[PDB]
Amino acid sequence: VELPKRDPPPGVPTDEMLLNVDKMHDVIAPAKLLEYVHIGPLAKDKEDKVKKRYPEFRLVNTGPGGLSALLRQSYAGTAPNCCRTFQRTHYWKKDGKISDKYEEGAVLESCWPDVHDTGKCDVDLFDWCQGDTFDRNICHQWIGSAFNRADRTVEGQQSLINLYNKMQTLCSKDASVPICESFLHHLRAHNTEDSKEMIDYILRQQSADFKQKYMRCSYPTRDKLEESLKYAEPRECWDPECSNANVNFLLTRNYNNLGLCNIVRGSGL
Amino acid sequence: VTLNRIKIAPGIADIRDKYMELGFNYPEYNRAVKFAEESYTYYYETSPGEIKPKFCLIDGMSIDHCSSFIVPEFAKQYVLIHGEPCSSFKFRPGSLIYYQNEVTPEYIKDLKHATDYIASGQRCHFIKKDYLLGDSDSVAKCCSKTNTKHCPKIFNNNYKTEHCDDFMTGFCRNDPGNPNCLEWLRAKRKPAMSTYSDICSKHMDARYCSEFIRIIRPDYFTFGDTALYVFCNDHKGNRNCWCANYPKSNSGDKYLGPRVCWLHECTDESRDRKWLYYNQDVQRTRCKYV
Amino acid sequence: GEVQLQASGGGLVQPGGSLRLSCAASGIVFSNNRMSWYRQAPGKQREVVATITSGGATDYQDSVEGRFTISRDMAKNTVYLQMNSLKPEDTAVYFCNARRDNFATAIYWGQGTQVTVSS
Numbered sequence: 013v014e015l016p017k018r019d020p021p022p023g024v025p026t027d028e029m030l031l032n033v034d035k036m037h038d039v040i041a042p043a044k045l046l047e048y049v050h051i052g053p054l055a056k057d058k059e060d061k062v063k064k065r066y067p068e069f070r071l072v073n074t075g076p077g078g079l080s081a082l083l084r085q086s087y088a089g090t091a092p093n094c095c096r097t098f099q100r101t102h103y104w105k106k107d108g109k110i111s112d113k114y115e116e117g118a119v120l121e122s123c124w125p126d127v128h129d130t131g132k133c134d135v136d137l138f139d140w141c142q143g144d145t146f147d148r149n150i151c152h153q154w155i156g157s158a159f160n161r162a163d164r165t166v167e168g169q170q171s172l173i174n175l176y177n178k179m180q181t182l183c184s185k186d187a188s189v190p191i192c193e194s195f196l197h198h199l200r201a202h203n204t205e206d207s208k209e210m211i212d213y214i215l216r217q218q219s220a221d222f223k224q225k226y227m228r229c230s231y232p233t234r235d236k237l238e239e240s241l242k243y244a245e246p247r248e249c250w251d252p253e254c255s256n257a258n259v260n261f262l263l264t265r266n267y268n269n270l271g272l273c274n275i276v277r278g279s280g281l
Numbered sequence: 282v283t284l285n286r287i288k289i290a291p292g293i294a295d296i297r298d299k300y301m302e303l304g305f306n307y308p309e310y311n312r313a314v315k316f317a318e319e320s321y322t323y324y325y326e327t328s329p330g331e332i333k334p335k336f337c338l339i340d341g342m343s344i345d346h347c348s349s350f351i352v353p354e355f356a357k358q359y360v361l362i363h364g365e366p367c368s369s370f371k372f373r374p375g376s377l378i379y380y381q382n383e384v385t386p387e388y389i390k391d392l393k394h395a396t397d398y399i400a401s402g403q404r405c406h407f408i409k410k411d412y413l414l415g416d417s418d419s420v421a422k423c424c425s426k427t428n429t430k431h432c433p434k435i436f437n438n439n440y441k442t443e444h445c446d447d448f449m450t451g452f453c454r455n456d457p458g459n460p461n462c463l464e465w466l467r468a469k470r471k472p473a474m475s476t477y478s479d480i481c482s483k484h485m486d487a488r489y490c491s492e493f494i495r496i497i498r499p500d501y502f503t504f505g506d507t508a509l510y511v512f513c514n515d516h517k518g519n520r521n522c523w524c525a526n527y528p529k530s531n532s533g534d535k536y537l538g539p540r541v542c543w544l545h546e547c548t549d550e551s552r553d554r555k556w557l558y559y560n561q562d563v564q565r566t567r568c569k570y571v
Numbered sequence: 572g573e574v575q576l577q578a579s580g581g582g583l584v585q586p587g588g589s590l591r592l593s594c595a596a597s598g599i600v601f602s603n604n605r606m607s608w609y610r611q612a613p614g615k616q617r618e619v620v621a622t623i624t625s626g627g628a629t630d631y632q633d634s635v636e637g638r639f640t641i642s643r644d645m646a647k648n649t650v651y652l653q654m655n656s657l658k659p660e661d662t663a664v665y666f667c668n669a670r671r672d673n674f675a676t677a678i679y680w681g682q683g684t685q686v687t688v689s690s
Binding site for chain 1: 284285286287289318319336338342343344345346347348349350351353356357359360361362363364372373374375376398403410412413414415416417419420435442443444445446447448450471472474475476478479482500501502503504506507510511532534535537538539540542543544545548559560563564567568569570571
Binding site: 212216223230231232234237238240241242244245246247248263265268269272 | 605607618619622624625626628629630632633636637668670672673675
C-alpha cells in the first residue's frame with residue numbers, strides 16, 4: 013500500500029552522551045552531598061563496577077539509553093586517614109593498601125569537608141599527638157584551629173569544652189610534653205579570662221621538679237624575693253630567671269608583669 | 282486490519298504538524314491522526330528550564346536522535362531525562378502522535394495490537410543543569426582558571442566551594458605566587474592554609490608568604506607560626522630569623538612573648554611581620570615606651 | 572615621726588579558713604612606695620610573703636602563691652592581704668612594710684597583727 017516512510021535526522025550527541033565514567037575520578041571525588049554527577053550512558057553490566065568503585069554514592073538512572081549519575085550519600089573516611097592531614101580530601105583503597113592517586117580496581121573513600129572545623133578529629137588526634145607519633149605541624153595546627161572552631165553550632169562548642177577538659181587533665185600531669193606546651197601557648201594567645209585561668213591551673217598543678225626546672229621566674233628563692241624589694245620595677249623586668257624562662261610556663265601574673273618593663277624607645281630591656 | 286489508503290495532509294498553521302489520513306476495511310479504523318516531526322534547532326528553552334522537542338524516542342532508537350534538534354553549544358548544559366510515553370509510526374520513526382478528539386489512547390492500543398504501523402516510546406525531554414566535565418584536564422583548566430569557557434559553577438566560583446581544593450593543593454605548590462592561588466588561599470579553608478604552611482616553611486622570604494601571613498592572621502595564625510618555626514630552624518643564621526629563633530642561644534627564645542620589645546630590631550616597623558610569631562607580634566604592639 | 576603602718580585583720584582560724592589582713596598607711600603614699608607583707612614565726616627570722624609595686628605589679632613567696640593575694644586601694648591608701656586555705660605553718664605575726672621608689676633610706680616597718688591556725 014506504499015507507506016510514506018521517512019528517516020529521522022542523524023543524531024547529534026550531547027556532552028552528557030559522550031561522558032565516560034572511567035575517566036571521571038577527579039570529577040566524582042570532589043562531589044558533595046545532594047549533588048548529581050552525570051557520568052553518561054552506562055552499560056548494564058558495568059553498574060556493579062561503578063557502585064563498588066564509589067560506595068559512598070548512589071547510582072541513579074537519570075535518563076534513557078542508560079544515562080546515569082552519581083549522588084553522594086555518605087563520607088566513609090576513617091579518623092586515622094582523614095585527621096592526620098589537612099590537605100587530603102580522599103583516598104583510594106586497593107588490595108589492602110591506601111593510595112592518594114586513583115587506580116583501576118580501587119575504592120574511593122572521602123573525608124568530611126568539615127572534619128577539622130568540628131570535633132570529629134579530637135579523639136583520634138588527642139591520642140596520636142601524644143608520644144612518638146607527635147607531628148609538630150599537624151598537632152599545633154589542630155590545637156590552634158580548635159580555638160577558632162568554625163562550628164559555632166552548640167555541639168561544635170560542646171566538643172571544644174570536652175577537649176579543653178581532657179587537655180586540662182592531661183597537662184596537669186606533665187605540661188612539658190609537646191602537645192601540652194602547644195596547648196599552653198594557644199591559651200596564652202587566646203587572651204581571655206577563661207584561658208588565663210586554665211593556664212594558672214595547669215601550671216600550679218605541676219610537680220616540684222617541674223617548678224624547680226621551668227618555673228623559677230614564678231617561684232623565686234628567698235634571697236631573690238628579698239633582693240627585688242630594693243627596686244621599684246617588678247622583679248620580672250631584671251630577674252635573669254625571667255629573661256631565661258620558657259614563656260609558655262609563666263604564670264599569668266608573671267607574663268603580664270613582663271610587659272611593664274618600660275622600654276627606652278629602642279632597646280630598653 | 283487491512284490498509285488501503287494513506288496520505289500526508291498538511292497542517293493548519295505549524296508546518297511541523299501534519300495529518301495521517303488512514304483508510305482501512307472497517308471504517309472504525311479509518312482516522313486522520315495528527316502527528317508532528319522535527320522542532321527546528323533549539324538554542325532556547327520551551328519551558329522554564331526545559332527543552333521538549335516534538336519527537337518520540339521509540340524504545341530501541343539511538344539516544345542521540347533525541348538531541349538532533351538542539352544547537353551543540355547550547356546542549357552542553359542540558360541532560361536527557363525520561364519523558365512521558367508517546368506513540369510513533371514504525372515506518373516514520375520519531376513522529377509524535379497527538380491524542381486529540383477522534384485519536385484516543387485506546388485507538389492507539391488497538392492499532393499497535395493490529396499491525397506493524399505504529400511504535401511506542403518516550404518523549405524527548407531535556408533539563409537545564411550546567412556544564413558536565415568528564416576529564417581530569419577539564420577540572421584542571423577550570424580550577425586553574427586558565428580556561429573557564431565551559432566550566433560548571435562548582436569548578437568556577439572563585440573557590441567559594443571546596444570542589445577545586447584537591448587540584449589546587451598540587452597546583453599552587455608549583456606556583457605559589459599565582460594570583461588565582463592567592464585567591465584560593467583567601468577562601469581560608471584548611472587545605473589551602475596547610476599547603477601554604479608547607480610552602481612558607483621553606484620559602485618564608487618570598488613575597489607571597491607575606492601575603493599568606495596577612496591572610497591567615499588573626500583567624501588562623503597557627504598555620505603561619507608552624508611555617509616560621511620550621512623555616513627559622515632550617516635557617517638559624519639568617520638575619521630575618523633573629524627574633525623568631527635567636528642564633529646565639531640553645532633555644533632561640535630570647536625575644537619570645539613580651540620579651541620581643543627588649544630589642545629594637547624586633548619592634549622595628551617596616552620589618553615584615555611574618556618574621557615574628559603571631560603572639561610575638563601582638564606583644565610588640567602592647568609595649569610601654571618612655 | 573608619724574609614719575603609721577598599723578596591721579589588723581588577724582585572728583585564730585581552723586586550717587582551711589580565711590582571713591583578710593589590712594594596713595591603712597599614713598604619712599606614705601602608695602603611688603610612690605612598694606608595699607610588702609612580712610611575717611615572722613616565733614623564734615624565726617622574718618620573711619616577705621607578698622609585695623606590690625608602686626605600679627601595681629604583685630609578687631608572692633612560693634609557699635603562699637595562689638593562696639594569698641595582695642591588693643591595694645589608692646583612694647583609701649590601704650593595702651590588703653587576702654589569705655585563703657590557711658595552713659598551720661602560716662602561724663606568725665604579719666606586719667606591713669613600705670619602701671620608697673628610689674630613696675633607699677626611706678623604709679618603714681609596721682606594727683604587726685597575730686595570725687594563728689590550729690585546731
